Enzyme design. Structure first.
Site, short mmCIF file in Angstrom:
data_model
loop_
_atom_site.label_atom_id
_atom_site.label_comp_id
_atom_site.label_asym_id
_atom_site.label_seq_id
_atom_site.Cartn_x
_atom_site.Cartn_y
_atom_site.Cartn_z
CG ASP A 14 17.01 -9.14 25.17
OD1 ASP A 14 16.18 -8.39 24.61
OD2 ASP A 14 17.48 -10.13 24.59
CB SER A 72 13.05 -12.98 19.42
OG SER A 72 14.27 -13.68 19.27
CG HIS A 78 17.70 -9.46 20.60
ND1 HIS A 78 16.87 -10.14 21.46
CD2 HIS A 78 17.69 -10.16 19.44
CE1 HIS A 78 16.36 -11.19 20.84
NE2 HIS A 78 16.85 -11.23 19.62
#
Lengths: 52, 161, 161, 161, 161, 161, 161
Positions: free
Chosen positions: G61, G113, G39
């Protein structure tokens, strides 16, 4: 066709010159932290509808 | 005190303008409007500040913009009062006499245009545009303010720095 | 001293307004009128106050009412001068600069709207409505009074509380 | 103090005028305009000044020119105020009485026309044209300034030095 | 001392050339010309030097350009005479004997082309291109200056760095 | 010592040249010939030299004349050898590097044309014509002597002082 | 100690990723494969990694690539056992409780992330993807490893960082 073309040229020139006169009158008030002078604001509409 | 506070103002409120990798001029944040002299060409060294649309005035040699909300607090404070006396500048002290600004040294250089003249309390009064070499002194073509109107003062023989 | 008088006058001149059982706004009593922001939803935590007829205005975002006779002794005092300086608030001291109210902390939070802004002497000046994320600060969108007119000042980017 | 400042200001703001090799008058740099009496004949001891085009006036006995850009920094400061009291001069002290300038000695000699009369603070108030042998004193025929206009005072018996 | 002047001249007269985000060569400034090896490929990391017109020669394995006006003061100085002795280098000391440049260390690695070999006075003598490992010593394939002609010497077994 | 001898030789062998009474150039006596740059105009401050006929060349940008017999004891000594090193000049020291005359200061101003550059023993080597702003240093557009020829070297971008 | 070799491994095995010039994510060198959250958008600050072709998987993901041969010695070591207890992370210590990874404080912020989670010995256990405000703490939606297959755990109400 000739008459219509000339009429359109004249009306565009007049409208552009009106808008130019507007901008050249109202531009110095964009260079100070000042008010818009509602008297002039009413007659000469400005892009700021509410702010400043 | 004064010098340090003025330097703090300048670091938080002056941005360079890049053209071809060389410094060309400076833009200052006054009141709530980005200021920059028109004759200086380039891009303001900031991604956020480059995207703003500028309003021109070739007669006043000035380009203005409405500052975005998230740099609104990092801008100086302004005034319009010009009593006789002395005032500050990034290159020393400036003298105000007879409606004219004079440089003690002739320390102006090309590319120095657009750095504000400060007041004693730290207020902004004028924006330097250029200098006319007045013998030993240097008069300033500067953009002063009225109560609500920008006025441009230009002595004979000034060069756009 | 000043903090103590401010908090005491707040305590006897501010009432909570709660909806679904949770506090949502602050309705203050000023002069001779119960006033509260219109955007807050709920009821005023007083049986006597809940039964009055509140005049609406969405342009001023202000609900007003005429207070009962037996609440007159707990009424603040009003004024209309706004010279430069520092004023009070439940969450600290508020700065006046160029017609704007500024909160040093940036700690104004939703649900804080309706708290009066006090003068040095214990008089009120305005009522906070919302705040704008002013970098390190927050700019107050507040309702003030001119000589006889209500005025609403909402700096751009403000969000209601 | 006053005398040293006067001497320096005069050495930077007066130039001799010589004809047939001999000096006859003095041209002074007041404000921003080279001013010399019209009746004196000769040339100014400077290339820039001597090349300039001089505007004539016989009724004021005056020639003026707008000073060049590279010398405006070496020009005296002027004024239009005439309080009663004493004033400076390169030949001593002058007495102002009844709207007239008086020389305590009668020390004026021909060829000293065009030499300015100074103020307390170094400002220039008049310019000497001639003298009149008035008893033990001497009445000066001079050229002053009003708020905007030049006026001439010439007591009878005056001689053009 | 010799180390320190060598390093100072290197820092003022060496610019890295990077392609695909990684360094591959060095461009140096000698006299009033910019040199670069041709067996290397990339772009010189400078706004001025990237857009200059370059003349190439694969026979001499070299590109040149004319340097701008403002940067002429940041360049080394050349000399053609090559007496026997020792010479300097960014990675140490080199020896000249019998018409070849020998590396005592065998310190040559891919990407080593493009640093000048200095004289004992800090003057530029040659620009390294490649090396041939002959036992303990590495013979240098280098481009040098004759009195007027540019000549390239390449020992057998050299590899492009 | 060296600078005192230089100042003596300068006082003996430089005549100033003015145009409308303003100093604009310097004519020096070398060997048995008076020489002057051509881009500067005026008259040499000497009755004896005023009547002498100048042979001109704008390609070399220079005019010379045979000096009067009685002043032959009032001239410097010339030399064509120009070894690498440092030389004397009326405003300090100059550097001879790579066939160029470099001014360490960048202090050159208009009106400096015609001032010779001296050898270590006081001999005249060349005559300054112009300067080119080479960053922090300044390249000197100068007139030098070969053994038999007179040649001119002018860096790109120089301006006539 | 533990934090020290954790930080060393961090410097060797995490690269920042920028879009619009500002960082938004990180990439880690684990085992023999680069892996980055799907993402997050941007470009890795390394030419070799930017040129590789990434295998994509939106269900998990994640995108991965085979590391270059010359970087094979700069990769952390992984594990498949997840003992109950506490583990180290760039902003302190995390705890594994009942199949859920949670931060004590909820101090994680978006853009983080891709920051890996190390074991007691420094072995890699999981990679952060997003956070879920679970009361006073924040659950971590991460990427784990089984004996052979990757599993993604996402607490309900989690937001991608």
């Amino acid at each position: 066709v000739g008459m219509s073309l000339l009429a359109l040229i004249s009306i565009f020139a007049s409208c552009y010159m009106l808008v130019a006169a507007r901008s050249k009158c109202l531009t110095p008030y964009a260079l100070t932290p000042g008010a818009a002078v509602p008297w002039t604001l009413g007659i000469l509409c400005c892009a700021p509808r509410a702010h400043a | 005190k004064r010098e340090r506070m003025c330097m703090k103002i300048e670091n938080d409120c002056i941005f360079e303008v890049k053209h071809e990798g060389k410094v060309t001029g400076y833009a200052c944040l006054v009141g709530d409007k980005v200021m920059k002299p028109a004759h200086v060409k380039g891009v303001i060294d900031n991604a956020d500040l480059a995207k703003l649309a500028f309003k021109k005035s070739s007669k006043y040699d000035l380009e203005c913009a409405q500052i975005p909300v998230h740099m609104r607090s990092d801008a100086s404070k302004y005034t319009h009062e010009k009593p006789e006396g002395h005032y500050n500048w990034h290159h020393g002290a400036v003298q105000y006499s007879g409606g004219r600004f004079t440089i003690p040294t002739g320390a102006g250089k090309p590319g120095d245009s657009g750095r504000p003249i400060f007041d004693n309390k730290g207020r902004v009064v004028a924006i330097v545009l250029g200098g006319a070499n007045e013998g030993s002194r240097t008069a300033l073509s500067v953009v002063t303010w009225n109560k609500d109107m920008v006025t441009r003062v230009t002595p004979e023989g000034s060069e756009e720095w």
